[PDB]
Amino acid sequence: GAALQVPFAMQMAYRFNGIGVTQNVLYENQKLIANQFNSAIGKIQDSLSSTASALGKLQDVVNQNAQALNTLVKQLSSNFGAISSVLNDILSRLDKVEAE
Amino acid sequence: IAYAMSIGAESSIAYSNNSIAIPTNFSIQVTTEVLPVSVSKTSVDCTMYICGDSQECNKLLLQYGSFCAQLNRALSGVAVEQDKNTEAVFAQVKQIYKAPVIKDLGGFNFSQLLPDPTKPSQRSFIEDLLFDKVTLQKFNGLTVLPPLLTDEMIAAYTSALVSGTATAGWTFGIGAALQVPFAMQMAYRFNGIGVTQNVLYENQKLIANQFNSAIGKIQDSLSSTASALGKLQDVVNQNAQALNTLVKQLSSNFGAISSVLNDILSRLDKVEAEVQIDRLITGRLQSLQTYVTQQLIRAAEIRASANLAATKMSECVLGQSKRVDFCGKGYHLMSFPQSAPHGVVFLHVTYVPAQEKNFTTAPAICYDGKAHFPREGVFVSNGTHWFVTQRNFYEPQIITTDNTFVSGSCDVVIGIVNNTVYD
Amino acid sequence: CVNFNFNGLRGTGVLTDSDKRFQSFQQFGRDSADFTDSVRDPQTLQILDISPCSFGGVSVITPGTQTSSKVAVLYQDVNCTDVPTALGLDQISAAWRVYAIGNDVFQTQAGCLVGAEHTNISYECDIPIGAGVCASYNSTNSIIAYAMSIGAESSIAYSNNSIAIPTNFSIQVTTEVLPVSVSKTSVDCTMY
Amino acid sequence: TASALGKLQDVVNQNAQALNTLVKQLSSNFGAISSVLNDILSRLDKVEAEVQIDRLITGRLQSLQTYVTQQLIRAAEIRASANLAATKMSECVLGQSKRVDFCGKGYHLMSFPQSAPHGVVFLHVTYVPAQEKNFTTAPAICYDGKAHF
Amino acid sequence: ILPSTEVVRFPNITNFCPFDKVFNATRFPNVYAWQRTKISDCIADYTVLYNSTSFSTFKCYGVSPSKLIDLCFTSVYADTFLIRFSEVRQIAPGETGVIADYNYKLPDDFTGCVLAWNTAQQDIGSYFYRSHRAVKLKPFERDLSSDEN
Ligand SMILES: *[C@@H]1O[C@H](CO)[C@@H](O[C@@H]2O[C@H](CO)[C@@H](O)[C@H](O)[C@H]2NC(C)=O)[C@H](O)[C@H]1NC(C)=O
Ligand SMILES: *[C@@H]1O[C@H](CO)[C@@H](O[C@@H]2O[C@H](CO)[C@@H](O)[C@H](O)[C@H]2NC(C)=O)[C@H](O)[C@H]1NC(C)=O
Ligand SMILES: *[C@@H]1O[C@H](CO)[C@@H](O[C@@H]2O[C@H](CO)[C@@H](O)[C@H](O)[C@H]2NC(C)=O)[C@H](O)[C@H]1NC(C)=O
Ligand SMILES: *[C@@H]1O[C@H](CO)[C@@H](O[C@@H]2O[C@H](CO)[C@@H](O)[C@H](O)[C@H]2NC(C)=O)[C@H](O)[C@H]1NC(C)=O
Ligand SMILES: *[C@@H]1O[C@H](CO)[C@@H](O[C@@H]2O[C@H](CO)[C@@H](O)[C@H](O)[C@H]2NC(C)=O)[C@H](O)[C@H]1NC(C)=O
Ligand SMILES: *[C@@H]1O[C@H](CO)[C@@H](O)[C@H](O)[C@H]1NC(C)=O
Ligand SMILES: *[C@@H]1O[C@H](CO)[C@@H](O)[C@H](O)[C@H]1NC(C)=O
Ligand SMILES: *[C@@H]1O[C@H](CO)[C@@H](O)[C@H](O)[C@H]1NC(C)=O
Ligand SMILES: *[C@@H]1O[C@H](CO)[C@@H](O)[C@H](O)[C@H]1NC(C)=O
Ligand SMILES: *[C@@H]1O[C@H](CO)[C@@H](O)[C@H](O)[C@H]1NC(C)=O
Ligand SMILES: *[C@@H]1O[C@H](CO)[C@@H](O)[C@H](O)[C@H]1NC(C)=O
Ligand SMILES: *[C@@H]1O[C@H](CO)[C@@H](O)[C@H](O)[C@H]1NC(C)=O
C-alpha cells in the first residue's frame, strides 16, 4: 500500500517487539541506543575510509570483465596455424587461391 | 519520440514527530506470478546429423566416438534432470485428494480454480485459458522426447493441491489432511498476520465478494492481454532459436569446398576428400559442443527457477509464508498453483490496506506514577479520548489493564502523555 | 537401403514414389539443412523421395547387463503397424525381426514399445519411458510396462462444521544430503 | 541402503567421467596423420609436420577449453548447492526456522550437521502429528449478547 | 542397416563425343587467339584417348580425374591452344608469367581440368604470342590488337 507515517522511536520500539525483547526496553535508554547507532555509523564510515579491501567483490567483478576483454584481445594476436597473425601481409604476399 | 525515464511520481510524507496514520479499511487482491519449470528435452544423434547415412563419413567419425558419447550422455542427463525438476516442483504431496462436492466453501467461489465435474478431462477453466494463451530437422537427428509427466497428471497434481488448500489447513503436507472449514481457515490465515480474528467475522460476505471479483478480474486479465505469460514464450523461443541456430550452422562449409558431403564424395577421390570431410566433421562437432554447452547453461538457469518455484510452493501453497514480498505484494501469502506449458502459475491472495486516517500518538501512558505500554497495537487519539488499536486495522477500544503492561517510571520516557487507565 | 548415383549425386537411402512439386529444370530438392531429399530420375522422369534408410528415433530400455541382459525397443514419432515399413526388415538381421513385429507390441503416446507387456495395476516408475508410461524389471523373467501411479486417491470429508484435531504426536529424523565442492583439478600447459 | 547418499557419488562420478572423457579425447588425431606426436615428428620433415602438430594442438586446446567451460558450469551448480547448504545451516542449525518444508517434513527445524566426502548431511528432528479425532466446531461463542472469539 | 546394390541411373544419351575434332585438329590456334568450343550432348568416355595419345599433364581443380566417370556435367567448354613446353606450368589458378598475364588468365574460382600433351612433330612452323601488354588480362579474356602500343 501507501506509506503510512510512523514516528521513528516507536518504529524502533516495534522493531524490538518483533524479536522477543519487550517494548519497554528502548524507552529507558533511548539516548544510549541512539548514541550507539551514531557511534556505529561513525565506525563503519571510518572502516570504509581506512581499509581498501571491504568492497573487494565489486573489484573482482570488474577485474574479471577486464581480464576477459584483455584475454580476447590477446587471443586476437595469434595465427591459428596460418602463416601470420595479421591478414594484411597474407592478403599482400599471397594470391587469392592460396590465401583463402 | 525520445524522452528521459520517469523513475516515478514524486511523493512526500508528513513526518510530524507525534502523528501516525492508521488504515481503517482493507482490500484483497490476487496477483499472478509465472515461473518456468523445464525446457523441451532435445536429444541429438551421432548418425544422421553429421553424416547423411554415409559410409565414409561414419568411418571417419569412428575416431570421434567418445565425443558423441559425451554429447549423448550430457543431453540424457539434462533430460532426466528436468524430469526430476518437474517432479520436484509439483509432486510434493502423495495422496491425490479429490475435489469437494460443493465448489462454494463458505461463500468463496472455487469453480474457476477446480475442474468441472461434468467433464472427463482434468485441466480447469483457468488452466484451459493458460493453455490457450501459450502457443507452442528430424533427418538431422534432433528429436524432442516427450516429458515424463503428461499434462493430465500435472493437472491432477494442481487439482489435488488446490483442493487440499481448500479442505485441509496448514497440515496439508505435514502428516495427513486434517479437515478445517474454509471460513475458519481464512480466519486463522488472518490471525497469522497481525489482523485480529474478529475482522473476518463482521464482513465475510464483503471479503468473499472481493475474492470473487478479484478472480473474475484476473480471469479477464488472462483473457485480454497476451503478454502476461511472456516468460514461458521466451523460454520456448530460446529453445526454438537454439535449434534454428544449429540447423543454420549446418548449412556452412567450415573451410571445405562445399557445405554438403554428397558433391565432395562425388567429385573428389578419397585421398583428397578425406581432408574436406575431416574439416566438415570438426566444424559440426564444435557446433554440437557449443549447442550442448549453451543447453547446459540454459538448464542451469531453468534449474534455479524450478528450485525457486519449488520453494514457493513449499512455503506459500503448503503453508503461510511470513516473508515480506515473497509471494505477491501483500501481507498473507496463500497461493493456488496452476499448470502451464513448461511452467507453473501462482495466484497469490494478498491483503492490502486501502483507506487511511490521521491520528496523534504517544508511546506510553502515565497512570498513578507508572508508565503503561501497549501489549499489541498503538495508542491512537481522537479529539476527546485516547484509545488503543492494532497496527494493521482500525478497531479501537478503551485503555484497559488487560491490554497494557506496566514498566518503569513516568520520567524515564520521552514523548509520554497521561490520562486514566480503565480497570 | 541402397546407394544411388543420380546424375553424379551419390547418396544412401530408400527411394519412395512421391509427388513433390518440381520445375521443368529441377533435378534434386533441398530440404531441412541443405539435404537432398527429393530427386528426379533421368530415365522415366518422376519424383523420388529419399527417406533415410532406417529409423533414427529408436530408444533401448534395459536393466543392467550384470542383472538380466534383457532388452526392450521403443519407436517414437510413429505408429506400430508401420514399424516394419520404417525399419525395413527385408535387410535387417533375424534377431532384429522379433522386435520389428512380435507378440508383445504396445502402442502408446510416444510410439510403440516392443518387449514388454501392459499390466493394469500401477507401480512406481523405475525406467522413465516418457509420456506417462514407465517400465520396470521387478514387476518369471521379463521387463514389465505400466502407467505411473501419481499416488493413492484419497478423500477428505469437508462437512462445513467439523474439524479434525490431532491427539498424539511423533518425532522423526530426516536426512538431507547436499554437495559442497568438487575435486580441485588443475591441468598443466607442459606435459598435456 | 547404499543409495541414500547418491548425490555425492553422482558428483564424484561426474568429475571422474569428465576426466576420463578428457583423456579419451586425447587419443584422437583431429585430422592429422596420427594421434601421437612421436611418429609425426619421426616420420616427417619439420615443414610438413608443422601443419599436423598445429592441427593436433588446436584440437587439444579446444578440448581443454570445453573441459574448462564445463568445469565452470559444474562449479556454478555446486556453488548454488553450497549457498543453499550455507543458508540451511544458518537457519536450521544455528537457530529454528519457521519456513514450511525447508528442513525436513515437520514443524520445528532443528538440525544436526555431519560431514561427508565433498558434502554435508543434515539430520532434521521434525515433529509430526499422528493420531486424529473428529469434532464439531463453531467459530464464535455468544454469551450475554456478546460474541467471544 | 548397411547399403547394398546400386541404383545408378544416367540420362539416355547415345552420342559418342567428338574428341578427334577437338584434340586432333589440323593445326591448333595461337595462344593469344585461343578458340573456345562448347561441348554439348555427349558422353565423356576418356578411354579412346588411352591409345596413341600420351597425356603429359592432366590436372583437375575442383574435381578429381578418378571421379570424371561418375559425374554428368551441365555444360562443358573447351579452350584449345598451343604453347611452348616450359610454359605449361603457368596454366593454373593464381599464377603469373607470359601466358598467365598477357595471353590467357584463369579465374580464381576455377572448376575444370587442364590437359596438355607434348607434340613436337605434328606442328612444325612459326606461331605468335603476346608479351608487351600494358595491363594484365581479366580471367577468360581475349585480346587481338596487334599494335595496341
Ligand atoms: C471498504 O472497501 C470496500 C471495497 O474496497 C467497500 O466495499 C464496497 O462497498 C460498496 C458500498 O456498499 C459496494 O457497492 C461494493 O460492492 C463493495 N465492494 C467493492 C469490491 O467495491 C467497503 O464498503 C469499504 N468499507 C468502508 C467502511 O469504507
Ligand atoms: C495526514 O496529514 C498530513 C499532514 O497534513 C496530510 O498531508 C498533506 O499535508 C499538507 C501540509 O502538511 C496539507 O496541505 C495537505 O492538504 C495534506 N494532504 C491532504 C490530502 O490533505 C495527509 O494527506 C493526511 N492524510 C490523509 C489520508 O489525508
Ligand atoms: C502416542 O504415540 C506414541 C508412539 O507413536 C506412543 O508411545 C508408545 O506407547 C507404547 C505403549 O505403551 C509403548 O510400548 C511404546 O514403546 C511407545 N513408543 C513408541 C515409539 O512406540 C504413545 O503411547 C501414544 N500415546 C497415546 C495417548 O496414544
Ligand atoms: C471423520 O469423519 C469423516 C466423516 O464420516 C470420516 O470419513 C469417512 O466418511 C464416510 C462418509 O462420509 C464414512 O462412511 C466413513 O466410514 C468415514 N471413514 C472412516 C474411516 O470411518 C473420517 O474417517 C473421520 N475421521 C477419522 C479419523 O475416522
Ligand atoms: C589403338 O588406337 C587406335 C586409334 O586410336 C585404335 O584403333 C581403332 O580401333 C577401333 C576398334 O578396335 C576401330 O573401329 C577404329 O577404326 C580404329 N581407328 C583407327 C584405325 O584409326 C585401337 O583400337 C587402339 N588399340 C588399343 C589396344 O587400344
Ligand atoms: C472521538 O471518538 C470518541 C469515541 O468515544 C468520541 O466520544 C469523540 O467525540 C470523538 N471526537 C471527535 C473530535 O470526533
Ligand atoms: C517533535 O518535534 C517537535 C519540534 O520541536 C516538538 O515540538 C514535539 O514536541 C516533538 N514531539 C514529541 C512527542 O516530543
Ligand atoms: C500529567 O502530565 C502533565 C504534563 O505532561 C503534568 O503537568 C502532570 O503533573 C502529569 N500528571 C501527574 C499526576 O504527574
Ligand atoms: C531413352 O530415353 C527416354 C527418355 O527419358 C526414356 O523414357 C527411355 O526409358 C530411355 N530408354 C533406354 C533404353 O534407356
Ligand atoms: C498412424 O499415424 C497417423 C499420424 O501419425 C495417424 O493419423 C493414423 O491414425 C495412425 N494409424 C494408422 C492405422 O494409420
Ligand atoms: C487389468 O487386468 C487384470 C487381469 O485380468 C484384471 O483383473 C483387472 O481388472 C484389469 N484392470 C481393470 C481396471 O479392469
Ligand atoms: C591425329 O591426326 C594426325 C594427322 O591427321 C594423324 O597422323 C594421327 O594419327 C591422329 N591421331 C589420332 C589419335 O587420331
PDB file of C-alpha atoms and ligand atoms in Angstrom, chain B residues 16-18 415, ligand 7:
ATOM      1  CA  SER B  16       5.216  15.220  12.144  1.00  0.00           C
ATOM      2  CA  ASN B  17       7.084  13.618  15.119  1.00  0.00           C
ATOM      3  CA  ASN B  18       3.925  12.645  17.041  1.00  0.00           C
ATOM      4  CA  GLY B 415       7.014  11.753  24.468  1.00  0.00           C
TER       5      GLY B 415
HETATM    6  C1  LIG F   7       8.571  16.538  17.820  1.00  0.00           C
HETATM    7  O1  LIG F   7       9.372  17.696  17.472  1.00  0.00           O
HETATM    8  C2  LIG F   7       8.708  18.959  17.647  1.00  0.00           C
HETATM    9  C3  LIG F   7       9.665  20.026  17.170  1.00  0.00           C
HETATM   10  O2  LIG F   7      10.457  20.531  18.236  1.00  0.00           O
HETATM   11  C4  LIG F   7       8.297  19.131  19.108  1.00  0.00           C
HETATM   12  O3  LIG F   7       7.581  20.351  19.257  1.00  0.00           O
HETATM   13  C5  LIG F   7       7.429  17.960  19.550  1.00  0.00           C
HETATM   14  O4  LIG F   7       7.129  18.080  20.937  1.00  0.00           O
HETATM   15  C6  LIG F   7       8.141  16.632  19.289  1.00  0.00           C
HETATM   16  N1  LIG F   7       7.287  15.514  19.656  1.00  0.00           N
HETATM   17  C7  LIG F   7       7.307  14.948  20.867  1.00  0.00           C
HETATM   18  C8  LIG F   7       6.361  13.806  21.075  1.00  0.00           C
HETATM   19  O5  LIG F   7       8.053  15.345  21.756  1.00  0.00           O
END
